[PDB]
Design an enzyme around this catalytic site. Structure first.
Site, PDB file in Angstrom:
ATOM      1  N   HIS A  53     -33.351 -57.356  84.894  1.00 61.78           N
ATOM      2  CA  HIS A  53     -34.761 -57.382  84.523  1.00 61.78           C
ATOM      3  C   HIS A  53     -34.976 -56.365  83.415  1.00 61.78           C
ATOM      4  O   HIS A  53     -34.340 -55.317  83.402  1.00 61.78           O
ATOM      5  CB  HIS A  53     -35.705 -56.946  85.673  1.00 61.78           C
ATOM      6  CG  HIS A  53     -35.612 -57.753  86.917  1.00 61.78           C
ATOM      7  ND1 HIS A  53     -34.610 -57.591  87.836  1.00 61.78           N
ATOM      8  CD2 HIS A  53     -36.388 -58.763  87.407  1.00 61.78           C
ATOM      9  CE1 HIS A  53     -34.782 -58.480  88.807  1.00 61.78           C
ATOM     10  NE2 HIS A  53     -35.858 -59.201  88.593  1.00 61.78           N
ATOM     11  N   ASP A  56     -35.138 -52.913  84.760  1.00 64.17           N
ATOM     12  CA  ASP A  56     -33.926 -52.326  85.269  1.00 64.17           C
ATOM     13  C   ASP A  56     -33.146 -51.612  84.173  1.00 64.17           C
ATOM     14  O   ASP A  56     -32.439 -50.637  84.446  1.00 64.17           O
ATOM     15  CB  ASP A  56     -32.968 -53.415  85.815  1.00 64.17           C
ATOM     16  CG  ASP A  56     -33.458 -54.253  86.927  1.00 64.17           C
ATOM     17  OD1 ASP A  56     -34.280 -53.764  87.758  1.00 64.17           O
ATOM     18  OD2 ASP A  56     -33.034 -55.432  86.993  1.00 64.17           O
ATOM     19  N   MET A  87     -27.457 -63.777  81.604  1.00 67.31           N
ATOM     20  CA  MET A  87     -28.799 -64.067  82.051  1.00 67.31           C
ATOM     21  C   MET A  87     -29.593 -62.782  82.064  1.00 67.31           C
ATOM     22  O   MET A  87     -29.076 -61.707  82.340  1.00 67.31           O
ATOM     23  CB  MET A  87     -28.743 -64.731  83.444  1.00 67.31           C
ATOM     24  CG  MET A  87     -30.084 -65.079  84.070  1.00 67.31           C
ATOM     25  SD  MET A  87     -30.944 -63.723  84.911  1.00 67.31           S
ATOM     26  CE  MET A  87     -30.210 -63.820  86.544  1.00 67.31           C
ATOM     27  N   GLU A 180     -36.589 -69.660  89.409  1.00 65.26           N
ATOM     28  CA  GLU A 180     -35.959 -69.250  90.684  1.00 65.26           C
ATOM     29  C   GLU A 180     -36.980 -69.443  91.796  1.00 65.26           C
ATOM     30  O   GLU A 180     -37.874 -68.609  91.932  1.00 65.26           O
ATOM     31  CB  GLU A 180     -35.533 -67.789  90.585  1.00 65.26           C
ATOM     32  CG  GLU A 180     -34.869 -67.227  91.842  1.00 65.26           C
ATOM     33  CD  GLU A 180     -34.414 -65.833  91.694  1.00 65.26           C
ATOM     34  OE1 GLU A 180     -34.200 -65.464  90.541  1.00 65.26           O
ATOM     35  OE2 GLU A 180     -34.185 -65.148  92.748  1.00 65.26           O
ATOM     36  N   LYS A 182     -38.860 -69.527  95.464  1.00 64.53           N
ATOM     37  CA  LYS A 182     -38.857 -68.816  96.731  1.00 64.53           C
ATOM     38  C   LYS A 182     -40.105 -69.254  97.483  1.00 64.53           C
ATOM     39  O   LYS A 182     -41.164 -69.376  96.862  1.00 64.53           O
ATOM     40  CB  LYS A 182     -38.900 -67.295  96.494  1.00 64.53           C
ATOM     41  CG  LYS A 182     -38.658 -66.484  97.724  1.00 64.53           C
ATOM     42  CD  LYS A 182     -38.725 -64.980  97.465  1.00 64.53           C
ATOM     43  CE  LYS A 182     -38.289 -64.179  98.642  1.00 64.53           C
ATOM     44  NZ  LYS A 182     -38.394 -62.697  98.386  1.00 64.53           N
ATOM     45  N   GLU A 216     -31.674 -70.043  94.847  1.00 59.90           N
ATOM     46  CA  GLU A 216     -31.026 -68.959  95.586  1.00 59.90           C
ATOM     47  C   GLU A 216     -30.770 -69.394  97.001  1.00 59.90           C
ATOM     48  O   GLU A 216     -31.672 -69.883  97.693  1.00 59.90           O
ATOM     49  CB  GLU A 216     -31.894 -67.691  95.577  1.00 59.90           C
ATOM     50  CG  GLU A 216     -31.267 -66.557  96.397  1.00 59.90           C
ATOM     51  CD  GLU A 216     -32.043 -65.288  96.374  1.00 59.90           C
ATOM     52  OE1 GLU A 216     -32.405 -64.816  95.285  1.00 59.90           O
ATOM     53  OE2 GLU A 216     -32.303 -64.741  97.491  1.00 59.90           O
ATOM     54  N   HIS A 219     -33.285 -68.223  99.630  1.00 58.30           N
ATOM     55  CA  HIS A 219     -34.661 -68.682  99.467  1.00 58.30           C
ATOM     56  C   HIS A 219     -34.871 -70.070 100.069  1.00 58.30           C
ATOM     57  O   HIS A 219     -35.831 -70.296 100.794  1.00 58.30           O
ATOM     58  CB  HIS A 219     -35.050 -68.687  98.002  1.00 58.30           C
ATOM     59  CG  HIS A 219     -35.154 -67.274  97.454  1.00 58.30           C
ATOM     60  ND1 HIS A 219     -35.455 -67.015  96.136  1.00 58.30           N
ATOM     61  CD2 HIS A 219     -34.981 -66.081  98.025  1.00 58.30           C
ATOM     62  CE1 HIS A 219     -35.435 -65.679  96.003  1.00 58.30           C
ATOM     63  NE2 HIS A 219     -35.172 -65.081  97.122  1.00 58.30           N
ATOM     64  N   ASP A 244     -28.082 -68.425  92.193  1.00 55.92           N
ATOM     65  CA  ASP A 244     -28.028 -67.152  92.872  1.00 55.92           C
ATOM     66  C   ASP A 244     -27.384 -67.349  94.250  1.00 55.92           C
ATOM     67  O   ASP A 244     -27.825 -68.141  95.076  1.00 55.92           O
ATOM     68  CB  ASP A 244     -29.426 -66.572  93.094  1.00 55.92           C
ATOM     69  CG  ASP A 244     -30.060 -65.911  91.903  1.00 55.92           C
ATOM     70  OD1 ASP A 244     -29.453 -65.842  90.814  1.00 55.92           O
ATOM     71  OD2 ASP A 244     -31.212 -65.442  92.093  1.00 55.92           O
ATOM     72  N   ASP A 254     -36.568 -62.045 103.206  1.00 58.24           N
ATOM     73  CA  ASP A 254     -35.452 -62.281 102.300  1.00 58.24           C
ATOM     74  C   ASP A 254     -34.451 -61.212 102.448  1.00 58.24           C
ATOM     75  O   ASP A 254     -34.767 -59.990 102.067  1.00 58.24           O
ATOM     76  CB  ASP A 254     -36.069 -62.331 100.919  1.00 58.24           C
ATOM     77  CG  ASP A 254     -35.159 -62.641  99.826  1.00 58.24           C
ATOM     78  OD1 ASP A 254     -34.165 -63.396  99.987  1.00 58.24           O
ATOM     79  OD2 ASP A 254     -35.496 -62.224  98.726  1.00 58.24           O
ATOM     80  N   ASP A 256     -31.014 -61.120 101.381  1.00 55.56           N
ATOM     81  CA  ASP A 256     -30.108 -60.861 100.266  1.00 55.56           C
ATOM     82  C   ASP A 256     -28.778 -60.272 100.779  1.00 55.56           C
ATOM     83  O   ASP A 256     -28.210 -59.359 100.172  1.00 55.56           O
ATOM     84  CB  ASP A 256     -30.747 -59.999  99.197  1.00 55.56           C
ATOM     85  CG  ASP A 256     -31.650 -60.762  98.220  1.00 55.56           C
ATOM     86  OD1 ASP A 256     -32.112 -61.972  98.546  1.00 55.56           O
ATOM     87  OD2 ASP A 256     -32.024 -60.053  97.197  1.00 55.56           O
ATOM     88  N   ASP A 286     -27.250 -62.468  93.686  1.00 56.61           N
ATOM     89  CA  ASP A 286     -28.538 -61.796  93.835  1.00 56.61           C
ATOM     90  C   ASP A 286     -28.573 -61.304  95.278  1.00 56.61           C
ATOM     91  O   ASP A 286     -29.012 -62.002  96.179  1.00 56.61           O
ATOM     92  CB  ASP A 286     -29.703 -62.716  93.520  1.00 56.61           C
ATOM     93  CG  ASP A 286     -31.034 -62.000  93.517  1.00 56.61           C
ATOM     94  OD1 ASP A 286     -31.051 -60.779  93.772  1.00 56.61           O
ATOM     95  OD2 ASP A 286     -32.064 -62.669  93.261  1.00 56.61           O
TER      96      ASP A 286
END
Length: 386
Positions: A53, A56, A87, A180, A182, A216, A219, A244, A254, A256, A286
């Site tokens: 991102h 980030d 990406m 993406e 969710k 994902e 998700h 993902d 979620d 992960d 992810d």
């Protein structure tokens, strides 16, 4: 020994291994990582690349000189390791201004800001070589019914994605977008909650060819859906631009988890499908190393993502290549499934008495599908019990 190399196209977000461990009920358990260190460590593990991102890579609110230095250092780490950046994406969720959304915020000024923030990072993503630009609309949605007119919100979502497509095209960029999905969390219900809803929405964009999905694992599993099936529909639509990979303990928040954790057989059938279909995009994790872990556990969890993919790849390939499985697939009529129902055409079907008046429905009904034997062969292959 299931050792990943760059050719496997494994990628990781900065925010994955960099997750400090804050959850809804807990403070961070690990220090922040410098992106340079993550690039280095992931490369040593056999990763192909990283993703980010905006916020980030460049702390929110950085000056232009600070931004340049963050990017310079990151570029040097990429050059020092051979890592790629396939990406990137925008953080349209963390900051309080996005509390009701980015592209579908009720406040128009927030929607405009979300677009400008996104556009600025598309330019950087292109500079760093990204082929896909992901959008996870985590704040788009509602906790209550009156708060969000969904038709109006979808108008705003389409407007936003159309503007982004116009922008890409105006700059001559080759980057494509991937939504993406969710279903919920952090909003009570999120707009475009599944693969299917995202695929449907894309068909109404002005330039649909510029948009695909970034599904994902966890998700779709938060809606209790079959992730391999949804991936198959995305592939069927020509829209699996990115994916993902992670794990998820059923219908919950979620998690992960690392890939392979959660629903292991779904992971097996997913890898079987991606590899059979010749998916060529990144295998992006992810995920979040659980907050129980120290940094040795972070890197162990990351390594495990890749290891589990590679084990599953081996077992799925062995399953498909096994003569005995090939025979079982024919016994279960997977060959007939792939043939047209009526290549003879409508009129011929209407005129074919074998299809109706003279069809022996009881004899057809009596033919077992042999699916349990097929599935136990699949199980035996997964477990290495051949």
């Amino acid at each position: 020994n299931y050792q990943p190399t760059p050719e496997d196209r494994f990628t990781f977000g900065l925010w994955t291994v960099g997750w400090q461990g804050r959850d809804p009920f807990g403070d961070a358990t690990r220090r922040a990582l410098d992106p340079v260190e993550s690039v280095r460590r992931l490369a040593e593990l056999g990763a192909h690349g990283v993703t980010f991102h905006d916020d980030d890579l460049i702390p929110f609110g950085s000056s232009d000189s600070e931004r340049e230095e963050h990017v310079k250092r990151f570029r040097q780490a990429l050059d020092d390791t051979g890592m790629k950046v396939p990406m990137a994406t925008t953080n349209l969720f963390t900051h309080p201004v996005f509390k009701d959304g980015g592209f579908t915020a009720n406040d128009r000024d927030v929607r405009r800001y979300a677009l400008r923030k996104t556009i600025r990072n598309i330019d950087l993503a292109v500079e760093l070589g990204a082929e896909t630009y992901v959008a996870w609309g985590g704040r788009e949605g509602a906790e209550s019914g009156g708060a969000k007119d969904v038709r109006d919100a979808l108008d705003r979502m389409k407007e936003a994605f159309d503007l982004l497509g116009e922008y890409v095209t105006s700059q001559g960029y080759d980057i494509r977008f991937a939504i993406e999905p969710k279903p919920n969390e952090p909003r009570g219900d999120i707009l475009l909650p599944t693969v299917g809803h995202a695929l449907a929405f894309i068909e109404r964009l002005e330039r649909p060819e510029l948009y695909g999905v970034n599904p994902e694992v966890g998700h779709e599993q938060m809606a209790g859906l079959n992730f391999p099936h949804g991936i198959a529909q995305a592939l069927w639509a020509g829209k699996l631009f990115h994916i993902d990979l992670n794990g998820q303990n059923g219908i919950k928040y979620d998690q992960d988890l690392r890939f392979g954790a959660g629903d292991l057989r779904a992971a097996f059938w997913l890898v079987d499908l991606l590899e059979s279909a010749g998916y060529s995009g990144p295998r992006h994790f992810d995920f979040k190393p659980p907050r129980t872990e120290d940094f040795d556990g972070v890197w162990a969890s990351a390594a495990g993502c890749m290891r589990n993919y590679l084990i599953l790849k081996e077992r799925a390939a062995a399953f498909r290549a096994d003569p005995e499985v090939q025979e079982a697939l024919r016994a279960s009529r997977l060959d007939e499934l792939a043939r047209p129902t009526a290549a003879d055409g409508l009129q011929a079907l209407l005129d074919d008495r074998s299809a109706f008046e003279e069809f022996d429905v009881d004899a057809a009904a009596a033919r077992g599908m042999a699916f349990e034997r097929l599935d136990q062969l699949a199980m035996d292959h997964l477990l290495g019990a051949r």
